[PDB]
Structure formats: structure tokens, C-alpha cells
Amino acid sequence: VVAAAEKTKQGVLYVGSKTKEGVVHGVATVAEKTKEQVTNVGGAVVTGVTAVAQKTVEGAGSIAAATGFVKK
Amino acid sequence: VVAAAEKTKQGVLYVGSKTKEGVVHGVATVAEKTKEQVTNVGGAVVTGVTAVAQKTVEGAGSIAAATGFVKK
Amino acid sequence: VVAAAEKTKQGVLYVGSKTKEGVVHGVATVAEKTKEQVTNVGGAVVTGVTAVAQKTVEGAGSIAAATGFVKK
Amino acid sequence: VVAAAEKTKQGVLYVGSKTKEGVVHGVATVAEKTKEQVTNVGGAVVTGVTAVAQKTVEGAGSIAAATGFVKK
Amino acid sequence: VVAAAEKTKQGVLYVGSKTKEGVVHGVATVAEKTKEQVTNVGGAVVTGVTAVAQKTVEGAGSIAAATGFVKK
Amino acid sequence: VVAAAEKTKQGVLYVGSKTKEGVVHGVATVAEKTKEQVTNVGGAVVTGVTAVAQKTVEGAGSIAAATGFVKK
Amino acid sequence: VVAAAEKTKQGVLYVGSKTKEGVVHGVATVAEKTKEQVTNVGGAVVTGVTAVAQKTVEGAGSIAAATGFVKK
Amino acid sequence: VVAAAEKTKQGVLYVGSKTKEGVVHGVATVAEKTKEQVTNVGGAVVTGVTAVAQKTVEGAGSIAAATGFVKK
Amino acid sequence: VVAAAEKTKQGVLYVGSKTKEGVVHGVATVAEKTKEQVTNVGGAVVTGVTAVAQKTVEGAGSIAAATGFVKK
Amino acid sequence: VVAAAEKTKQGVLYVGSKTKEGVVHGVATVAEKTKEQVTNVGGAVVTGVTAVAQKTVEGAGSIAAATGFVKK
Amino acid sequence: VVAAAEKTKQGVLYVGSKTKEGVVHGVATVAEKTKEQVTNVGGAVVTGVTAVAQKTVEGAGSIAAATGFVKK
Amino acid sequence: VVAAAEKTKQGVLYVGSKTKEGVVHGVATVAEKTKEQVTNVGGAVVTGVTAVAQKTVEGAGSIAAATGFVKK
């Protein structure tokens, strides 16, 4: 689960968007008459209408994540 | 679960957006008549209409996360 | 599960979009009359209408992730 | 499950899109009268209408992931 | 399951799209009256209307993934 | 299951598309009155209307994947 | 349009109802960007959840109605 | 359009109902970008969930109605 | 259009109903970009989930109706 | 168009119903980009899930109706 | 178009029904890009899931109706 | 078009029904790019899943109807 990263050293960008009536959902757990119910989220959940990422991680970066469900 | 990162050293950007009536949800746990109910969120939850990230992590950065559900 | 990355050293881009009435879902768990119910998300969940990624990871980067369901 | 990558060193791009009424789903688990029910997601889930990736991983990058279902 | 990659060193592109009423699904598990039900996703799930990837992995990159279902 | 790749060193492209009413499915598991039911996906699942990949893996890249169903 | 009625002269009843979440509409005129807009109602408009009429007009009764739209 | 009626002269009933989530509409005129728009209702509009009429008009009764649209 | 009726003179009933999620519409006129739009209703419009009529018009009754669309 | 009726003079009934998810429509006029649009209803429109009529018109009754579309 | 009727004078019944997911339509006029569009209904339109008529018109009754489309 | 009827004067019945997923249509007029479009209904339109008529017109009854399309 260990993560690592390193880095050493030694023009128009356009985005446009037009939208009418946009309905967005993410993670859902819909239920009825359930003796138990669990939701466990361990990661990135990006929801949106215009989810735009521009020129990210130009330098150095690292992400580590560990989730886990245990039931006995 | 250990994370690490390092860094050593030694033009128009445009985004536009137009939206009418946008409905956004994230993590949900909808239920009826449930003897137990748990929600456990351990990560980044970005919800929005225009979720725009520009030129992030130009230097160095690191994220670590660990969530965990245990039931006995 | 270990991840690693490294890096050493020693023009118009256009996107356009037009949309009317777009309905987007992600991970779902729909159910009725269920004695148990679990949702466990351990990864990146990107939902949207215009999910645009431009010029990411120009430098160095790394992601590691480990999720796991255990039931006894 | 170990991943690794490295790198050493020593013009118009156009995308356009027009859409009317687009309905997008991701991972789903639909059910009725089920004594148990589990959803376990461990990877990238990109859902959208215009999911556009431009000029990503110009430098160096690495992703590792391990999910696992165990039931006894 | 180990992956690795390396790299060392020492013009118009057009895409257009027009669509009316496009309905897209991903992974689904539809069922009725089922004593158990499991969904386990360990890989990349890209769903969309215009899923366009342009000029990716110009540098170096690597992906590793391992999912696994065990039931006893 | 081990993968590896390496690389060392020492004009119009057009795509157009027009579509009306396109319905796309991916992996599905439809069932009724089933005592057990499992879905296990370990690979890339690209579903769409215009799934266009242009000039990918110009540098170096590698993908490894291993999924596995075990039932006793 | 003339109406008339006359009359001369010379045991359990049960209704039960149970309802959850009932949404009822009547006459509607929904519009956008309309140079003129008219609604003209001349009759009985009974809207409800349990609209119950029991043992009405046991004697004598009469109803007359005349509505009319004129535009020149 | 003239109506008339006359009359001269000289045991359990049960109804039951059970409902969950019932959505009822009546007369509607939905529109967009319309230079003119008219709604003209001249009659009985009974909308409901349990619209029950029991033992009506045991004696004598009469209804007359006349509506009319004129446009020049 | 003239109506008339006359009359001279000289045991369990059961109905049951059970319903889940019933969606009922009546007269509708759905449109887009229409230079003119008219709705003209002159009669009885009974919409419902359980529309039950029991033992009506045991005596005497009469209904007359006349609607008319004129456009020049 | 004239109607008339007359009358002179000188045991269990059971109905049961069970329904899940019933969607009912009546008269509809769906359209797009239409220079004119008219709806004219002159009669009885009974829509429902359980539309039950029991022992009606035991005595005497009469209905007359006349609608008419004129366009010049 | 004239109607008339007359009358002079001088045991279990069972119906049962069970239904799951029933979708019912009536009169429809679906269209696109139409310079004119008319709907004219002059008669009885009974739509439903269980449309049951029991022991109607035991006495005397009469119905007359006349609709007519004229276009010049 | 004239109708008339007269009448003078001087045991279990069972129906059962079981149905799953029944889709019923009536009169339809589906079209695209049509310079004119007319629907004219003058008669009884009974649509349903269980359309059951039991012991109707035990006494006397009469129906008359006349519709007509004229275009010049």
C-alpha cells in the first residue's frame, strides 16, 4: 500500500461549456426493509457538471489510500 | 499506507461555463425500516457544478488516507 | 500493492461542448427487502457532464490504492 | 501488484461536441428480495457525457491498485 | 502482477461529434429473488457519449491492477 | 503476469461523427430466482457512442492485470 | 344552454382509504417565452386524494354552465 | 344544448383501498417558445387517487354545458 | 344536442384494491417552438387510481354537452 | 344529435385487485416545431388503474354530446 | 344521429385480478416538425388496468354522440 | 344514423386473472416531418389489461354515434 514519487531538475488553452438541466449523482445505496445497511467510501469521489482539471501535478506528487471492510 | 514524495531543483488559460438548473448529489444512503444503518466516509468528496482545478501541485505534495470498517 | 515513479531532467488546445438535459449516475446499489446490504468504494469515481482532463501529470506522480472486502 | 515507472532526459488540437438528452449510468446492482447484497469497487470509474482526456502523462506516472473479495 | 516501464532521451488534430438521445450503460447486475448477490469491479470503467483520448502517455507510464473473488 | 516495456532515443488528422438515438450497453448479468449471483470485472470496459483514441502511447507504456474467480 | 329538472312525490355504506405520498395536479399551463398566455376555466375542477361523493342529489337538482373564448 | 330530466312517484356496500406513492395529473399544456397559448376548460375535471362515487342521482338531476373556442 | 330523460313509478357489494406506485395522466398537449397552441376540453375527464362508481343514476338523470372549435 | 330515454313501472358481488407499478396515460398530443397545435376533447375520458363501474343506470338515464372542429 | 330507448314493467359474482407492471396508453398523436397538428376526440375513452363493468344498464338508458372534423 | 330500442314485461359467475408485465396501446398516429396531421376519434376506445364486462344491458339500452372527416 506504500506509495512514493520523486522529481529532480538541473500557448492558449481553451475550454468552453454550455449546459441546460443536468442532474448528477454519485455513490448511492437505496434500500427498503433491510436489517443492516453500511456505506464505506475510502476514495476520491468527484461529481459535477463541468469537472475540469488543467495542468495538475506539474511538479511531483503522490497519493496513497487503503480502505477495508471487515465483518465477522 | 505510508506515502511520500520529494522534489529538488538546481500563455493564456481560459475556462468558461454556462449552466441552467443543475442538481448535484454526493454520497447517499437512503433507507426505510432498517435495524442498523452506518455511513463512514474517509476520502475526498468534491461535489459541485463547476469543479475546476487549475495548475495544482506545481511544487511537491503528498496525501495519505486510511479508513476502515470493522464489525464483529 | 506498492507503487513508485520517478523523473529526472538535465500551440492552441481547444475543447468545446454543448449539451441539453444530461442525466448521469455513478455507482448504485438498489434493493428491496434485503437482510444485509453493504457498499464499499475504494477508488476514484469521476462522474459529470463534461469531465475534461488536460495536460495532467507533466512532471512526476504516483497513485496507490488497496481496498478489500472480508466477510466471515 | 507492484508497479513502477521512470523517465530521464538530457499545432492546433480541436475537440467539439453537441449533444441533446444523454443518459449515462455506471456500475449498478439492482435487486429485489435478496438475503445479502454487496458492492465493492476498487478501480477508476469515469462516467460522463464528454469524457475527454488530452495530453495526459507527458512526464512520468504510475498507478497501482488491488481490490479483493473474500467470503467464508 | 508486477508491471514496469521506462523511457530515456538524449499539425492540426480535429475531432467533431453531433448526437441526439444517446443512452449508455456500464456494468450491471440485475436480479430478482436471489439469496446472495455480489458485484466486484477492479478495473477501469469508462462510460460516456464522446469518450475521446488524445495524445496520452507521450512520456512514460505504467498501470498494474489485481482483483480477485474468493468464496469458500 | 509480469509485464514490461522500454524505450530509448538518441499533417491534418480528422474524425467526424453524426448519430441519432444510439443505445449502448456494457457487461450485464440479467437473472431471475437465482440462489447466488456474482459479477467480477478485472479489465478495461470502454463503452460509448464515439469512443475515439488518437495518437496514444507515443512514448512508452505498460499495463498488467490479473483477476481471478475462486469458489470452493 | 338552458337546463331544467323536476321531481314530484305522492344498510351500512363503508369507504376506507390508506395512502402514502400522493401528489395531485389539476389544470396547468406551463410555458416559456410566450408573447401571450391565457387560461380560462368555466367548469367544476375537483382535485384531491380521496374525492368521495356519497348519496348526492337524492331530491332534485340542476346545473348549467357556459364558458367561451373569443379572440379577434 | 338544452337538457332536461324529470321523475315522479306514487345491504352492505364496501369499498377499500390501499395505495403507496400515486402521482396524478389532469389537463396540461406544456410548451416552450410559443407566440400564443390558450387553455379553455368547460367541463368537469375530477382528478384524484380514490375518486369514488356511491349512490348518486337517486332522485332526479340534470347537467348542461356548452363551451366554445372562436378565433378569427 | 338536446337531451332528455324521464322516469315514473306507481345483498353485499364488495370492491377492494391494493396498489404500489401508480402514475396516471389525463389529457396532455406537449410541444416545443410552436407559433400557436390551444387546448379546449368540453367533457368529463375522470383520472385516478381507483375510480369506482357504484349504483349511480338509480332514479332519473340526463347530461348534455356541446363544445366546438372554430378558427378562421 | 338529440337523445332521449324513458322508464315506467307499475346476492354477493365481489371485485378484488392487486397491482404493482401501473402507468396509465390518456389522450396525448406530443409534438416538436409545429406552427399550430390544437387539442379538442368533447367526450368522457376515464383513465385509471382500477376503473370499476357497478350497477349503474338502474333507473333511467340519457347522455348526449356533440363536439366539432371547424377550420377555414 | 338521434337515439332513443324505452322500458316498461307491469347468486355470487366474482372477479379477481393480480398484475405486476402494466403500462397502458390511450389515443396518441406523436409527431415532429409538423406545420399543423390537430386532435379531436368525441367518444368514450376508457383506459385502465382492470376496467371492469358489472350489471350496468339494468333499467333503461341511451347515449348519442356526434363529432366531426371540417377543414377547408 | 337513427338508433332505437325497447323492452316490455308483464348461480356462481367466476373470472380470475394473473398477469406479469403487460403493455397495452390504443389508437396511435406516429409520424415525422409531416406538413399536416389530424386524429379524429368518434367511438368507444376501451384499452386495458383485464377489460371484463359482466351482465350488462339486462334491461334496455341504445347507442348511436356519427363521426365524419371532411376536407376540401
Side-chain angles (χ1 to χ4, degrees), chain B residues 12-36:
Chain B
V12 184
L13 300 202
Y14 195 101
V15 165
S17 173
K18 297 188 59 185
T19 311
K20 169 185 174 174
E21 199 198 333
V23 171
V24 185
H25 274 44
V27 180
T29 308
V30 190
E32 294 172 10
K33 299 186 180 180
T34 73
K35 196 180 173 184
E36 283 157 18

Side-chain angles (χ1 to χ4, degrees), chain A residues 12, chain C residues 11-14, chain D residues 11-14 55, chain E residues 11-13 55:
Chain A
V12 184
Chain C
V12 184
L13 300 202
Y14 195 101
Chain D
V12 184
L13 300 202
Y14 195 101
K55 231 165 180 179
Chain E
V12 184
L13 300 202
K55 231 165 180 179

Side-chain angles (χ1 to χ4, degrees), chain C residues 10-21:
Chain C
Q10 180 191 344
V12 184
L13 300 202
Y14 195 101
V15 165
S17 173
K18 297 188 59 185
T19 311
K20 169 185 174 174
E21 199 198 333

Side-chain angles (χ1 to χ4, degrees), chain G:
Chain G
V1 296
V2 194
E6 278 153 20
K7 185 204 178 181
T8 65
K9 274 187 174 178
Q10 180 191 344
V12 184
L13 300 202
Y14 195 101
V15 165
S17 173
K18 297 188 59 185
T19 311
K20 169 185 174 174
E21 199 198 333
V23 171
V24 185
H25 274 44
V27 180
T29 308
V30 190
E32 294 172 9
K33 299 186 180 180
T34 73
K35 196 180 173 184
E36 283 157 18
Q37 184 157 349
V38 183
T39 297
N40 195 102
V41 175
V45 183
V46 170
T47 71
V49 166
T50 70
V52 174
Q54 295 192 324
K55 231 165 180 179
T56 77
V57 200
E58 205 276 340
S62 163
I63 299 98
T67 189
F69 192 95
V70 178
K71 178 174 182 176
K72 302 171 186 170

Side-chain angles (χ1 to χ4, degrees), chain D residues 4-72:
Chain D
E6 278 152 20
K7 185 204 178 181
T8 65
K9 274 187 174 178
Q10 180 191 344
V12 184
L13 300 202
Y14 195 101
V15 165
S17 173
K18 297 188 59 185
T19 311
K20 169 185 174 174
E21 199 198 333
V23 171
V24 185
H25 274 44
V27 180
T29 308
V30 190
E32 294 172 9
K33 299 186 180 180
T34 73
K35 196 180 173 183
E36 283 157 18
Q37 184 157 349
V38 183
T39 297
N40 195 101
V41 175
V45 183
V46 170
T47 71
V49 166
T50 70
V52 174
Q54 295 192 324
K55 231 165 180 179
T56 77
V57 200
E58 205 276 341
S62 163
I63 299 98
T67 189
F69 192 95
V70 178
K71 178 174 182 176
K72 302 171 186 170

